Write an enzyme that holds these catalytic residues in place. Structure first.
Site, PDB file in Angstrom:
ATOM      1  N   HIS A   1     -55.865  -5.507   1.584  1.00 40.11           N
ATOM      2  CA  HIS A   1     -56.808  -4.552   2.173  1.00 40.11           C
ATOM      3  C   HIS A   1     -58.173  -5.132   2.094  1.00 40.11           C
ATOM      4  O   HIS A   1     -58.768  -5.102   1.056  1.00 40.11           O
ATOM      5  CB  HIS A   1     -56.736  -3.236   1.442  1.00 40.11           C
ATOM      6  CG  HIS A   1     -55.366  -2.631   1.431  1.00 40.11           C
ATOM      7  ND1 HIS A   1     -54.379  -3.038   0.539  1.00 40.11           N
ATOM      8  CD2 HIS A   1     -54.836  -1.603   2.140  1.00 40.11           C
ATOM      9  CE1 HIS A   1     -53.285  -2.321   0.748  1.00 40.11           C
ATOM     10  NE2 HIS A   1     -53.533  -1.428   1.704  1.00 40.11           N
TER      11      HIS A   1
ATOM     12  N   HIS B   1     -58.252  -1.997   7.698  1.00 42.98           N
ATOM     13  CA  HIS B   1     -57.943  -1.244   6.489  1.00 42.98           C
ATOM     14  C   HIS B   1     -56.974  -2.029   5.639  1.00 42.98           C
ATOM     15  O   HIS B   1     -57.184  -2.171   4.420  1.00 42.98           O
ATOM     16  CB  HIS B   1     -57.331   0.142   6.784  1.00 42.98           C
ATOM     17  CG  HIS B   1     -56.557   0.694   5.632  1.00 42.98           C
ATOM     18  ND1 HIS B   1     -57.158   1.339   4.587  1.00 42.98           N
ATOM     19  CD2 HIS B   1     -55.233   0.645   5.334  1.00 42.98           C
ATOM     20  CE1 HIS B   1     -56.248   1.680   3.690  1.00 42.98           C
ATOM     21  NE2 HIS B   1     -55.070   1.257   4.110  1.00 42.98           N
TER      22      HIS B   1
ATOM     23  N   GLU C   1     -51.648  21.949 -12.280  1.00 40.25           N
ATOM     24  CA  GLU C   1     -50.725  21.115 -13.027  1.00 40.25           C
ATOM     25  C   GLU C   1     -51.008  19.639 -12.766  1.00 40.25           C
ATOM     26  O   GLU C   1     -51.054  18.846 -13.692  1.00 40.25           O
ATOM     27  CB  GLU C   1     -49.287  21.328 -12.565  1.00 40.25           C
ATOM     28  CG  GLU C   1     -48.726  22.660 -12.906  1.00 40.25           C
ATOM     29  CD  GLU C   1     -49.088  23.746 -11.922  1.00 40.25           C
ATOM     30  OE1 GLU C   1     -49.633  23.469 -10.819  1.00 40.25           O
ATOM     31  OE2 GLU C   1     -48.783  24.931 -12.249  1.00 40.25           O
TER      32      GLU C   1
ATOM     33  N   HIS D   1     -37.907  29.640  -9.932  1.00 40.17           N
ATOM     34  CA  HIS D   1     -38.322  29.381 -11.277  1.00 40.17           C
ATOM     35  C   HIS D   1     -37.222  28.786 -12.178  1.00 40.17           C
ATOM     36  O   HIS D   1     -37.469  28.663 -13.363  1.00 40.17           O
ATOM     37  CB  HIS D   1     -38.869  30.666 -11.916  1.00 40.17           C
ATOM     38  CG  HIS D   1     -40.243  31.070 -11.394  1.00 40.17           C
ATOM     39  ND1 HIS D   1     -41.325  31.340 -12.216  1.00 40.17           N
ATOM     40  CD2 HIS D   1     -40.666  31.275 -10.136  1.00 40.17           C
ATOM     41  CE1 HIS D   1     -42.379  31.658 -11.452  1.00 40.17           C
ATOM     42  NE2 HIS D   1     -41.995  31.638 -10.192  1.00 40.17           N
TER      43      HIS D   1
END
Ligand SMILES: Cc1ncc(C[n+]2csc(CCOP(=O)(O)OP(=O)(O)O)c2C)c(N)n1
Ligand SMILES: Cc1ncc(C[n+]2csc(CCOP(=O)(O)OP(=O)(O)O)c2C)c(N)n1
Ligand SMILES: O=P(O)(O)OC[C@H]1O[C@@H](O)[C@H](O)[C@@H]1O
Ligand SMILES: O=P(O)(O)OC[C@H]1O[C@@H](O)[C@H](O)[C@@H]1O
Ligand SMILES: [Mg+2]
Ligand SMILES: [Mg+2]
Lengths: 632, 632
Positions: A28, A256, A391, A453
């Site tokens: 890159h 890129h 989280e 869950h």
């Protein structure tokens, strides 16, 4: 510090980067070229010691855009770090010190990056860690900055917003975020996918925001000066041109992610006054100026070591750096029926009391995960970190706590929501850092909250992930021994814990938790062996009793850690795994076929109901398991 | 529409919700009580037909806070949906129609929620889908709203920011987001973890933001009126009190997640004018007023069906609703060596040309995933969606496209970054929706980008996930047959595809891709069977030739889909799996022990290097695999 020297410095960085990519035929070059002016200036402000990358009060530099590695490597080489010119010429090659994205095995690399967004969250974590370290050791000893370079991609990822939310709340006026705003990503113009008012976004999160031309040396320098004085976390929005300096590739998305090409580099070098017929050239003025970091960093570290010697906090720092795990007295849970979320929460409290650097928290689930460290206060004065419903950023933050140098962090949530933080868990594994993952509510035993869950496939994921121990203790005693292994191991661990109460086990007959699996019941000429983990071990003990009453000798094997059992020798595995071996787990865990002839698991998602109703529905009952084992 | 009726309506919703939780001894009464005034008013504005939940131009209501289920169920019951009072009394019980969090098997539920953040992203996707449907069918036929109720937790999750970024960019003036701002989460005061200027945040993303008291009926009503007229996506910040109406539990975190208790409910009912000694009571005025949705919705649907009959777009809508997959002529890749990212990209183009409702895109990786749909334009006028660097929101968005009623969506990224979207992939599996996951760059074959970009454990994760087919085609022909299965299946599928060029296979000898595994080479009295998927199949064909030259008869098995092979009968599996079976995969795939006596995999993370160098390092060579198979 003047324009002609900064220009030569920046161009040196550009063409090392460009030449590295070209020789590898991979990598890159765009972002390196675009960032080269910024890093040239930043090199004057960074406080670091190239000869001691572990100096505790160094400024922490994170490249969140890890694809910009060639630039990082150029800068570490030029600054005096233990990375050579020959290392640069082996960019991206097998077993080099210059891999495609940065890894901590290369000295000078603060944290592994590559997955976008992580580094921004890591940088917030280094800034939090630094504020805690300051709380512990005083601002005479901890006062450094955290600099993060990021791109468009990083700021589109959710985790960037999560972590920056926290940076604002905690007023991290040691955190400086430099946004490479080049309006280009892989699909081209960033306007195809993103048009936020970035300044307004960050100010909404409590940042001071500066806006510059990232190719104007005085503007860069003035922004860094103002940023270092901010009373807020600070974002520098640096407008740059991708592949700045590479002529026909300036502003092109084609720059890129692929080499610039030999003729483009030849022209670029011509326009900058560099000889186009040589590669990996470091001009003299640039060489001396970059490597002056060596002398200056030595002097800064020495001045700090003098402040340490006068400090009241020397003894503390030595305990932080050299924790003594063997002296810790754990709770004795022998014969006590408890949910392992509860045993684990008692253990967390013991560790926080014994280890001044042990801290962590939950993603809004303290009360349900049982992770509150009682009477130990809230961050920054205390140990409990309230991560919110974040989280992913929690895990990336704690990865940086684990790299800071004096902390032993834990991250907590329901095991089902490990999936939200799994990419960061992976980077903990890749680095082999000591970061502990606390995952409660491990199965259909959850009950009424239902299938969204109730974990099914998560045990397989964590087991399959290399460099990561997955403990699923059957009782408090197993939970203790799991921690004892985890603290001594060289890799991260997760703890997979129940909502519901489990029954205490009898003592090991042969082997123990440290072997990954061990015998709880052993019978001469065993016809069956029932192998289980966590909540399924008692079902197996009961089923083996019923089998024995029917005339079938049985072994029962507890397996609190699959990964550790994989490492045992043949003779150990053979003694445990006798006759026909049946594995029993409230999970979809086909990996058990490695040790088992049959597997008695869950092959579907769960159900919303009372825990006893759902376990019965899914077949976790003595009568049903015994009928399976007897094939009828 | 007056205060006394709205109050009785809201309180009816409150006490059904509260009584449901109490009878279950499980669930979340706080959010229902806090939202009850808002939903009472919203019921006057929602356009829906309780007797036909599939009406295409209905307003789409999403409860992103799925823990608020009791409220949703109360409202569906009261409004006339096929959910009974007895269903309400079996809240959270095994096999009821009222599970702990909402599931699409309960009629009236738009999308499964529970994992926080998903629903906000789903709601943005329903709004995008609606804008596309309007593009296809005209604004005479598609003009509805998308209402989302969310809480603190949803807005802290990264995915909320990602999806709302997209909602602003695309000017989704059909999207109305109602934020339940009650300042309470599980750990208590939301200020412990979050203090963003939420208004400024959303305005930075292109939203109009209104700010109300969520217990004042006229203010709620005025905000909804203003929101429905917005030229922007609109956020209503509704300040509420958690457990409003429940006395000593008002504003308490203890009300989030546990029953209110019998005496608290008794008092609450007394203060509202309800009889405290009965439960599940629906007063008359409230009953008639809620159920008037039945007559009104019937009339709205009839008026729409009249507009459809006059429409030029009837034939189109019928093709969208009834796609014909069997007529599609796929590319013929027999004997062509290609990377399967490339074969798959050709297949994507064929499908987009044949199916007016097939669309999707990549998370900034179109050019590398090979997913650009050539000459088909950019969303909304065309089919290519530019999701940006937002894998998680992409997947949640496309889950909603798949539920909208006329679309066949695909989501694309590198397989390593499937981990960023895995929670949404899970909800696609749980719903059993037709959403296709395109995952390129499937292994260490990636090469130079290194270990953070080389999948190891992801195949295990997707295989372990129920209701989800994981295809790993060895060549273009397998890639076609995989699509043919995927389009006919009743569950989502992923496609796991190579960066590097693979070699075309010979024809099946026995079985085919639809059996999950099949024979490519069959030998009488085979001593070994080499079983592989994707890029490892040619290594196995070559190794089997070398084994045969050494005097060992071999079967070679291609396994493009583990999950399908698990479903085959005994006789089929026995014919394929002869002698000693060795599984070979560039993954850590212990699940292969289900079919294999030995597994030749990768047990560590990868390395940065040339693909041929890394494969050799990890043992993927004929000489090394043959030496393993011959145990020496
Ligand atoms: C989580 C994640 N998703 C996708 C990628 C693949 N990827 C590598 S760089 C890049 C986009 C680069 O955009 P930007 O940050 O604007 O970098 P620049 O083009 O300015 O170099 C992507 C999508 C990744 N590394 N991480
Ligand atoms: C992704 C995710 N993480 C964690 C949870 C666990 N959980 C359930 S509700 C809740 C917090 C609720 O906060 P809020 O949205 O403010 O709801 P309220 O307390 O206002 O009912 C959490 C963390 C979840 N459902 N999803
Ligand atoms: O009894 P525990 O499982 O600790 O509480 C369950 C929690 O999980 C979620 O459903 C709710 O938010 C609730 O508070
Ligand atoms: O040749 P491919 O793998 O298609 O390109 C690899 C891409 O993956 C990332 O490292 C870079 O962003 C680069 O563009
Ligand atoms: Mg960019
Ligand atoms: Mg709340």
């Amino acid at each position: 510090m003047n324009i002609q020297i900064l220009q030569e410095q920046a161009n040196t960085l550009r063409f090392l980067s460009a030449d590295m990519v070209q020789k590898a035929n991979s990598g890159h070059p765009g972002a390196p070229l675009g960032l080269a002016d910024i890093l040239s200036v930043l090199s004057y402000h960074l406080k670091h010691n190239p000869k001691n990358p572990t100096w505790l009060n160094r400024d922490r530099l994170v490249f969140s855009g890890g694809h910009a590695s060639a630039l990082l490597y150029s800068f570490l080489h030029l600054s005096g770090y233990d990375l050579s010119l020959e290392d640069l010429k082996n960019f991206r090659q097998l077993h080099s010190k210059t891999p495609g994205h940065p890894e901590i095995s290369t000295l000078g690399v603060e944290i592994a990056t590559g997955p976008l967004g992580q580094g921004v969250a890591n940088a917030v974590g280094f800034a939090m860690a630094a504020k805690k370290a300051q709380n512990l050791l005083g601002s005479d000893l901890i006062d450094h900055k955290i600099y993060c370079l990021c791109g468009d991609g990083d700021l589109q990822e959710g985790i960037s917003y999560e972590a920056c939310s926290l940076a604002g709340l905690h007023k991290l006026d040691n955190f400086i975020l430099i946004y490479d705003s080049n309006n280009i990503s892989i699909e081209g113009d960033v306007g195809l996918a993103f048009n936020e008012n970035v300044k307004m976004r960050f100010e909404a999160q409590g940042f001071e925001v500066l806006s510059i031309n990232g190719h104007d040396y005085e503007e860069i320098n003035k922004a860094l000066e103002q940023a270092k004085k901010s009373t807020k976390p600070c974002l520098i929005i640096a407008k740059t041109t991708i592949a700045k300096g590479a002529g026909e590739l300036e502003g092109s998305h084609k720059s890129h992610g692929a080499p610039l090409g030999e003729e483009v580099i030849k022209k670029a070098k011509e326009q900058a006054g560099f000889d186009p017929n040589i590669s990996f050239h470091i001009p003299q003025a640039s060489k001396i100026r970059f490597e002056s970091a060596v002398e200056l960093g030595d002097l800064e570290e020495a001045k700090w070591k003098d402040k340490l010697e006068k400090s009241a906090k020397k003894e503390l720092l030595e305990r932080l750096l050299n924790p003594d795990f063997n002296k810790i007295a754990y709770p004795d849970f022998k014969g006590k029926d408890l949910a392992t979320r509860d045993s684990n929460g008692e253990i967390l409290n013991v560790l926080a009391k014994n280890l001044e650097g042990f801290l962590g928290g939950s993603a809004d689930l303290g009360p349900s995960n049982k992770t509150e460290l009682h009477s130990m206060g809230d961050f920054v004065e205390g140990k409990n970190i309230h991560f919110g419903i974040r989280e992913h950023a929690m895990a990336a933050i704690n990865n940086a706590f684990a790299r800071y140098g004096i902390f032993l962090p834990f991250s907590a949530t329901f095991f089902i929501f490990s999936e939200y933080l799994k990419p960061a868990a992976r980077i903990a594994a890749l680095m082999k850092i000591k970061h502990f993952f606390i995952f409660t509510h491990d199965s259909i035993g959850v009950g009424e909250d239902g299938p969204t869950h109730q974990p099914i496939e998560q045990l397989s994921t964590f087991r399959a992930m290399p460099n990561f121990l997955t403990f699923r203790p059957a009782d408090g005693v197993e939970n203790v021994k799991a921690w004892q292994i985890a603290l001594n191991a060289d890799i991260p661990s997760a703890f997979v814990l129940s909502r519901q109460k489990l029954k205490a086990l009898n003592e090991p007959v042969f082997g123990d938790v440290k072997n990954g699996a061990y015998l709880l019941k052993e019978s001469k000429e065993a016809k069956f062996t029932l192998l289980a983990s966590g909540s399924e071990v008692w079902l197996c003990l009961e089923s083996a009793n019923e089998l024995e009453k029917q005339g079938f000798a049985c072994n029962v094997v507890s397996m609190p850690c699959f990964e550790l059992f994989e490492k045992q020798d043949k003779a150990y595995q053979e003694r445990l795994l006798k006759g026909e071996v049946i594995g029993v787990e409230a999970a979809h865990s086909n990996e058990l076929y490695k040790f088992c002839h049959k597997v008695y698991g869950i092959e579907s998602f769960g159900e919303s109901g009372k825990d006893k109703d759902v376990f019965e529905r899914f077949g976790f009952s003595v009568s049903k398991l015994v009928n399976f084992i007897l094939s009828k």
